[PDB]
């Protein structure tokens, strides 16, 4: 189903792009909520935990500017806009 709606929320696997079109690491959403306020860009941040594929590429690590939004492993937690996240199908096996 890809009509043009989608919808990522807490507890969902999605690919996160750290660099500018380099590689999107898969991860499950742990939290969701903005951060800045008319300082750079109006976009909601989505906390996603990097999977074994892109494990070891987290900056927030569950904490942002001292505020512990969510809990995750070392270099796993990461916040990004929905547009940055990539909805992945939960049906690897289908016949």
Structural domain that includes position 52: 1-95
* Neighbouring-strand partners of residue 48: 29, 78
| Residue 19 region by backbone torsions, left for phi larger than 0, else alpha for psi between -120 and 50, else beta | beta
Structural determination approach: NMR
Strands (E), the chain: 13-17, 24-32, 46-50, 63-64, 67-68, 77-80, 85-87
Total domain count, the chain: 1
CATH number at residue 24: 2.30.30.190
Q: CA–CA separation, 20 vs 67, rounded Å? A: 27
Nearest to 76 by CA among 92, 53, 95: 53
């Amino acid at each position: 189903g890809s009509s043009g709606s989608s919808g990522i929320d807490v507890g969902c696997p999605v690919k996160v792009q750290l660099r500018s079109g380099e590689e999107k690491f898969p991860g499950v959403v742990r939290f969701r909520g903005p951060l800045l306020a008319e300082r750079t860009v109006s976009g909601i941040f989505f906390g996603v935990e990097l999977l074994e594929e892109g494990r070891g590429q987290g900056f927030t690590d569950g904490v942002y500017q001292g505020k512990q939004l969510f809990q995750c492993d070392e270099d796993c937690g990461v916040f990004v806009a929905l547009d940055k996240l990539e909805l992945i199908e939960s049906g690897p096996s289908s016949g």
